Design a protein around this nucleic acid. Structure first.
Lengths: 153, 116, 69
RNA sequence: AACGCAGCUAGCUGCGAGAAUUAAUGUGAAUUGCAGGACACAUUGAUCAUCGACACUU
RNA sequence: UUCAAACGAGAACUUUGAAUCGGGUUCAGAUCCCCGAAUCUUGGAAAGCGUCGCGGUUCCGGCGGCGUAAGGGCUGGUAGCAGCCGACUU
């Protein structure tokens, strides 16, 4: 008749919210007879009270769009609200470029492809924004190494 | 005198030797073991403690500390105490949870008072 | 807790006056010998079965033995 | 001034862990809402009053 | 906000259903009670948690079964090669 107490106890025992607690609609008499956490544990084993499943919230709709968004399907001029810097900061773009270029110079130095003197000159030039790409930097040593070979010969 | 400051010299101090005691006789200890324990408690929640925790519940004088409670129950009912937990009820009475030693049991003891 | 690493130490710490009991735990890959002392619960782990029984015969007498398995 | 004290008691009143009172004296069969307890009433005692003994928590 | 049911003399409005740490323990207390530990491994799987069952129906708070187009990186030896891997952008 009065099942406010049993729903609170069931939620505490089931460690779920009261919205997820289901009381048997045509067995109400002996849940009303339950007044202790022991009696609640009696009923959830017998199936009179069970924990309702969580309400479904599927991410498949968003997952499908991200795959399309992976190919730039919704990245047009009409789907951008923030600034170009806001969407992709220029500092992090510059910060990434110095790291991936300075790493290459270190690798070329330890691999004896280039010497310390050439390393320092390029290290100041990469900081000078003269190169913008690994490939753009990479072919630069080649003409630099090519004339050096010609100079000796 | 090797110091430029003058300090008060320390003089003899005599222990007081009264010509008569100001109090004729020592005050009687009015807070004894019978005063320590007021009465045992019989509420529903209490009964759980005697069975599952080997613990007795008592209403005690508000001025008694945990040490005083432990000695009183020992000589009053000839048992041993492991630990005592006390709290002050909202009504102003002090409730003490006295846990007996493992060798003693609260069931047979609480029969001796007649509470159980 | 403390881990006893070599066999000889374990039967010593089991002989201390404060050692109350030893509990033997039987796992799929090892057997753990845990002795409850006054301040620490010392555990000796052996990975091979045959040494477990021979040590089990050699506990000091009178010390309580509990078999978890 | 505070806090406690009645078998059932919140206030008022009285009292102070001896806590709606102890002792003693006078008096002399009750108290009372209920119950219980009483009660040779001197081989000496309920109640009430008096009050000089005792006691009087922070 | 609606439908149905229950209790009830009575229902828009009540209830149910549908739209110093770890672990346990109460009706109401837990770092305080109980247990166990103290001030990658021991702790530790025994616990706990998921499910699948067996007992019992104010007693069992009892048992078990399973599972826990362009922007880069890495690896092995002509201006790199070869392979593999990875977001977000213009």
């Amino acid at each position: 008749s009065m099942l406010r107490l049993q729903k609170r106890l069931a939620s505490s025992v089931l460690r779920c919210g009261k919205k997820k607690v289901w009381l048997d609609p045509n067995e109400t008499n002996e849940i009303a007879n339950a007044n202790s956490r022991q009696q609640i544990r009696k009923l959830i084993k017998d199936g009179l009270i069970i924990r309702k499943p969580v309400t479904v919230h599927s991410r498949a709709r968003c997952r499908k769009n991200t795959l399309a968004r992976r190919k730039g399907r919704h990245m047009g001029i009409g789907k951008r609200k923030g600034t170009a810097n806001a969407r992709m900061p220029e500092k992090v773009t510059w910060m990434r470029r110095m790291r991936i270029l300075r790493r290459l110079l270190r690798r070329y130095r330890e691999s004896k492809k280039i010497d310390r003197h050439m390393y320092h000159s390029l290290y100041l030039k990469v900081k000078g924004n003269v190169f913008k790409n690994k490939r753009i930097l990479m072919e630069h040593i080649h003409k630099l190494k090519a004339d050096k070979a010609r100079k000796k010969l | 005198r090797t110091s430029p400051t003058f300090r008060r010299p320390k003089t003899l101090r005599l222990r007081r030797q009264p010509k008569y005691p100001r109090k004729s006789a020592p005050r009687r200890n009015k807070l004894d073991h019978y005063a320590i324990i007021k009465f045992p408690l019989t509420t529903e929640s209490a009964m759980k403690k005697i069975e599952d925790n080997n613990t007795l519940v008592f209403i005690v004088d508000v001025k008694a500390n945990k040490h005083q409670i432990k000695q009183a129950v020992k000589k009053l009912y000839d048992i041993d105490v492991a630990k005592v937990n006390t709290l002050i009820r909202p009504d102003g009475e002090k409730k003490a949870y006295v846990r007996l030693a493992p060798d003693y049991d609260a069931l047979d003891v609480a029969n001796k008072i007649g509470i159980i | 807790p403390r881990k006893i690493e070599e066999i000889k130490d374990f039967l010593l710490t089991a002989r201390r006056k404060d050692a109350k009991s030893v509990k033997i735990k039987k796992n799929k890959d090892n057997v753990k010998f845990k002795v409850r002392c006054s301040r620490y619960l010392y555990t000796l782990v052996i990975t091979d079965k045959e040494k477990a029984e021979k040590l089990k015969q050699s506990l000091p007498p009178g010390l309580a033995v509990k078999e978890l398995k």
